[PDB]
Design a protein around this ligand. Structure first.
Ligand SMILES: CSC[C@H]1O[C@@H](n2cnc3c(N)ncnc32)[C@H](O)[C@@H]1O
Ligand SMILES: CSC[C@H]1O[C@@H](n2cnc3c(N)ncnc32)[C@H](O)[C@@H]1O
Ligand SMILES: [Zn+2]
Ligand SMILES: [Zn+2]
Lengths: 180, 182
């Protein structure tokens, strides 16, 4: 197995990676800090400015707090609108200020716990994802990578959205064939 | 649900990725019947579109096939393991210089290629070329199928650009063929 791409050495895709540029930026809030089937790591392959943090219940990192409170960005929590309280601001599109998409990586019981017990995210708006936009990139819950492609298209980053789609498709195919 | 041109599930269609190459060598596929997706001889035509294919016949060979294996513009070779040749049969381990090579492939199952090798009087005066398969290492590829053999022959003839192009195309097909199988 390759160590960079985690695919068996006969199926390495590291030679095919070509990054794209986007006005949007991603922040990965990880619960365990990686398994080969985790799709959030594919985002950094196409957008190397992606930042990642290990989630902590008691003591959040000072690097993380300085980012979500940086007025340069318009931060927003990416989580389905059904899970939000009646007073929580919910939006359906990313507004001038470049978005900072905060993803909650992990299984659904863990992403719910991260959503419910992080006081530093409670004043941020929630963005509900229009997954219908995956049709324009010929893609069919939905993993962290598929949601990211929809967000890039929602913000006008078509070049980066198309790139992540071909890279994600390239990975899924070599992953299935590696099981054979 | 399956693409008609590449014979893979439409979600794994690779037709948009095909880029042809150019080579001094030419291929002639002698086939036993008409297609199963795991048959690899068609990948050669994707990268070298001047490939010609004929249906084998025990009684009446075609005149397009007979005129081509007697056209003195080419140097024709029967691609077959030398172990099955008569002791008087000329055997070679490299394509000669000058005249461009014309590789005659016997595509089918090993009982079918053996029958064609013995019952074709129009092929018996031609030399048998023995393929050097260790050349597949230069293309990161590990008997073998028809397409794998053709990559070696291209390398023996000095057509490295086309040998590499067919290398990617073969790996692409095999990867997407295994994935859609699961
Ligand atoms: C493996 S959990 C997938 C993650 O992607 C994001 N996500 C997935 N589906 C949705 C959705 N329908 N709406 C908003 N965010 C989502 C959330 O960050 C979630 O924790
Ligand atoms: C019978 S299907 C195998 C295909 O690979 C070719 N092939 C496999 N091994 C050899 C070999 N050792 N010498 C020549 N052709 C071979 C065959 O001629 C046919 O095209
Ligand atoms: Zn790799
Ligand atoms: Zn196709």
């Amino acid at each position: 197995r390759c160590q960079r791409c985690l695919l068996p050495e006969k199926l390495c895709l590291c030679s095919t990676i070509t990054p794209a540029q986007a006005k949007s930026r991603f922040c990965l809030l990880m619960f365990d800090t990686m398994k080969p089937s985790n799709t959030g790591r594919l985002i950094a392959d196409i957008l190397p400015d992606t930042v990642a943090f290990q989630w902590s219940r008691t003591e959040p990192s000072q690097d993380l707090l300085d980012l979500v409170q940086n007025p340069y960005y318009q931060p927003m929590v990416v989580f389905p609108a059904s899970y939000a309280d009646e007073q929580r601001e919910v939006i359906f599109t990313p507004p001038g200020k470049p978005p900072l998409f905060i993803m909650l990586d992990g299984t659904w019981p863990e992403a719910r716990k991260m959503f419910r017990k992080s006081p530093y995210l409670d004043n941020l708006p929630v963005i509900s994802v229009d997954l219908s936009r995956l049709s324009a990139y010929r893609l069919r819950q939905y993993c962290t990578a598929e949601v990211a492609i929809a967000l890039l298209d929602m913000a006008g980053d078509t070049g980066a959205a198309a790139g992540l789609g071909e890279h994600f498709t390239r990975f899924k195919t070599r992953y299935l064939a590696g099981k054979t």
